[PDB]
Design a protein around this nucleic acid. Structure first.
Ligand SMILES: NC(=O)c1cccc2c1O/C(=C\c1ccc(OCCN3CCOCC3)cc1)C2=O
Ligand SMILES: [Zn+2]
Ligand SMILES: [Zn+2]
Lengths: 222, 456
DNA sequence: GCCTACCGGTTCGCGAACCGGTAGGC
DNA sequence: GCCTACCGGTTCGCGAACCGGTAGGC
């Protein structure tokens, strides 16, 4: 959908379009989506984050233009936001929300790499299956949904198509199929969901849940 | 089908088939939201895979020799199911999420004006250009004959869209039919998204496309065939295929003056964009059209009326006569349902020739259409069954050719008077329409060739 | 009756190699 | 769309070693 794309390298394999060296794994990298000559589909032209700003591209507002911006770590978002460039109650709720937005961002990130330290992929796969959740393709995406599951709740099936809703940037988009020919287009900020049930098998669940986690709903950007 | 020349082994090894089922399928997949609009041709020559975005250089292919012939079936049926979702054999097909859907592939002794008539109506490259504006795939549609059952389903999808549009159905409902249609009939939009079929005239535009597309494949069906023996001439072979007796009415003829009067007189005051000019008059006589019309020579109120259509259609109109729209097709565009439409004014009919400043010449018909006891209507109304004792329908217009100057012609009433006000003015039509709901009621008399003079 | 140097054959341990399913790349 | 580097899971290959049967010596 978007022209640009930012994420942490899913593998230290892809090369950089400008300098032509291997972009290392788990490193901040940016892309520009182009039409592939070989097949009918868009393809990312990956750049080193350092090399991205010398090609001449100038993203005015990263949060609205670049994809995967909200999924990044809070401090890394500010690096993109700054590098892109180179009343009492109103400002209070405005400032205090950004405090709670950071609070939510690095809460999930603390929870994400906590599971990466303790649990293998097969544990995280069977975590989602136990909660009646669709297991996604990808390592990063699996713990992203497990962390989403634990903090907010196990997502109930869709109203019409009975598919799986997924958090994407600014809302929960339905990824199911209203029919064989077309994909479902349900979208919401307040989806339906029961409470996340961890199985008995968790000797470090008391450590992860002890990280000051109370009941709260997903907060979104302005 | 034959071998795809993208392999490079087209005139070397034949495409294989196991008894009945031919090991060759051309798949398609479109998602209007994503914008994807792709093809996927699979063949078993060696196995050959072709893929890309329909109507563009985007894509690639892979020719690959097999270890053996039984491994070919293994590789073919596996690739097939992986891409399409279903098995190679099935009772009825079922589409699957993000999987593909298979598309169902199947010295001349005559006058100079008559030779030009065949020259005009059998030039198929002119018919190809005609489809370019519709955005039909130009690449492999001439060699790749799209199935009859396929086009009927494509018609059905269009009729479902109009039904969905009429009663303001869901966007998803519309999204599906728009997806379904462009999958079933491959379009060429280039690098931009397929547009949603949400309008009332968009379905009509795509309905007209199918009507024209059909007649081109019919024009091919005539052209491709016969008995290629060294005796007759090339133009004569195509003349005999038309299955009609065409003659040239001389300009000195007294009946020719009547037609030129009928052209000159019945030009519309509102249609002042162009000016007609009769190049030729052809007297036309179809094979057995008098045998089927005999019944309606008993019928009263017979009128010699105009009927225009694309130069591409006249290849089929001569061979099969004037035909009513199929039952699967949508009723959109028609004023009073599916049937043969006629007009008393040459101009109103002449608009259906679809001529431009670049393409000046155009063909228009004159048929002895047995109207009989007429059912007169003012406003538009989609009728299914006619009222009792009525053999035709009439759309009452504001302007009508002078009824006190209606000249006769071989026992046929020719209304070649100039325009005056009608009896009733509570209508939503400016000019008259004459509708027959039976192909037997029409009998084509004259075919004209008209030059259009615009001002640009 | 002992002891023991020598030999054929089974087991055991561990890294190389193999492999099918797949997430990432273009 | 297809290609392929990566992952875990099992197998495979081969030398050390373990072990029992034995025949030349005293
Ligand atoms: N074309 C005419 O001679 C004509 C003249 C005056 C009025 C109308 C005409 O046509 C109307 C509508 C119309 C025209 C063509 C058409 O074609 C449907 C497909 N057929 C094309 C010919 O071969 C059979 C199939 C459908 C509606 C009209 O309302
Ligand atoms: Zn670089
Ligand atoms: Zn849904």
């Amino acid at each position: 959908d978007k022209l640009y794309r930012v994420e942490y390298a899913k593998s230290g394999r892809a090369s950089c379009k400008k300098c032509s060296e291997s972009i290392p794994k788990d490193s901040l990298r940016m892309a520009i989506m182009v039409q592939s000559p070989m097949f009918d589909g868009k393809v990312p032209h990956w750049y080193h984050f350092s090399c991205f700003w010398k090609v001449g591209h100038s993203i005015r507002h990263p949060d609205v233009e670049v994809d995967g911006f909200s999924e990044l770590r809070w401090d890394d978002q500010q690096k993109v936001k700054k590098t892109a460039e180179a009343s009492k109650k109103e400002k209070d709720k405005d400032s205090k929300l950004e405090k709670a937005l950071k609070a939510q961002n690095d809460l999930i990130w603390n929870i994400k790499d906590e599971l990466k330290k303790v649990c293998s992929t097969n544990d995280l796969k069977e975590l989602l299956i136990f909660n009646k959740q669709q297991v996604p393709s990808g390592e990063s995406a699996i713990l992203d949904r497990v962390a989403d599951g634990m903090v907010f709740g196990a997502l109930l099936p869709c109203e019409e198509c009975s598919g799986q809703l997924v958090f994407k940037s600014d809302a929960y988009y339905c990824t199911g199929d209203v029919t064989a020919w077309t994909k479902c287009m349900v979208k919401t900020q307040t989806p339906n969901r029961k409470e996340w049930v961890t199985p008995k098998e968790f000797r470090e669940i008391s450590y992860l849940k002890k990280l000051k986690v109370k009941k709260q709903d997903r907060i979104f950007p302005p | 089908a034959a071998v795809d020349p993208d392999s490079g082994l087209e005139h070397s090894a034949h495409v294989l088939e196991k008894g009945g089922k031919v090991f060759s399928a051309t798949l398609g997949l479109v998602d209007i939201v994503k914008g994807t609009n792709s093809y996927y041709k699979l063949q078993l020559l060696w196995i050959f895979r072709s893929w890309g975005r329909v109507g563009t250089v985007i894509g690639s292919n892979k020719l690959e020799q097999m270890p053996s012939k039984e491994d070919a079936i293994e590789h073919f049926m596996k690739l097939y199911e992986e891409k399409t979702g279903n098995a190679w054999h099935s009772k009825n097909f079922t589409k699957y999420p993000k999987k593909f859907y298979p598309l169902e592939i199947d010295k001349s002794k005559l006058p100079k004006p008559v030779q030009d008539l065949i020259k005009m109506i059998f030039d198929v490259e002119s018919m190809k250009k005609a489809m370019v504006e519709y955005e039909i795939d130009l690449q492999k549609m001439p060699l790749g004959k799209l199935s009859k059952r396929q086009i009927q389903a494509a018609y059905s999808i269009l009729s479902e869209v109009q039904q969905a549009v009429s009663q303001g159905s869901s966007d998803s409902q519309i999204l599906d039919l728009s997806n379904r249609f462009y999958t079933l009939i491959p379009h060429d939009f280039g690098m931009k998204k397929p547009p949603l079929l949400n309008n009332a005239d968009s379905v009509q535009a795509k309905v007209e496309m199918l009507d024209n597309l059909l007649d081109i494949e019919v024009a091919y069906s005539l052209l491709r065939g016969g008995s290629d023996d060294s005796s007759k001439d090339p133009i004569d072979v195509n003349y005999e295929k038309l299955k009609t007796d065409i003659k040239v009415v001389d300009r000195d003829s007294e009946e020719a003056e009547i037609i030129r009067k009928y052209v000159k007189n019945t030009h519309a005051t509102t249609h002042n964009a162009y000016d007609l000019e009769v190049i030729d008059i052809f007297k036309i006589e179809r094979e057995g059209e008098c045998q089927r019309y005999k019944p309606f020579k008993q019928l009263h109120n017979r009128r010699l009326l105009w009927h225009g259509s694309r130069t591409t259609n006249f290849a089929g109109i001569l061979s099969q006569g004037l035909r009513i729209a199929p039952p699967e097709a949508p009723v959109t565009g028609y004023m009073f349902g599916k049937g043969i439409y006629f007009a008393d004014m040459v101009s109103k009919s002449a608009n259906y020739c679809h001529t431009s400043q670049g393409d000046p010449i155009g063909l228009i018909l004159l048929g002895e259409v047995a109207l009989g006891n007429m059912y007169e209507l003012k406003h538009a109304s989609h009728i299914s069954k006619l009222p009792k004792g009525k053999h035709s329908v009439k759309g009452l217009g504001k302007t009508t050719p002078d009824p006190s100057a209606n000249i006769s012609l071989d026992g046929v009433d020719v209304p070649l008077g100039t325009g005056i006000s009608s009896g009733v003015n509570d209508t939503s039509l400016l000019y008259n329409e004459y509708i027959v709901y039976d192909i037997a009621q029409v009998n084509l008399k004259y075919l004209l060739k008209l030059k259009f003079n615009f001002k640009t």
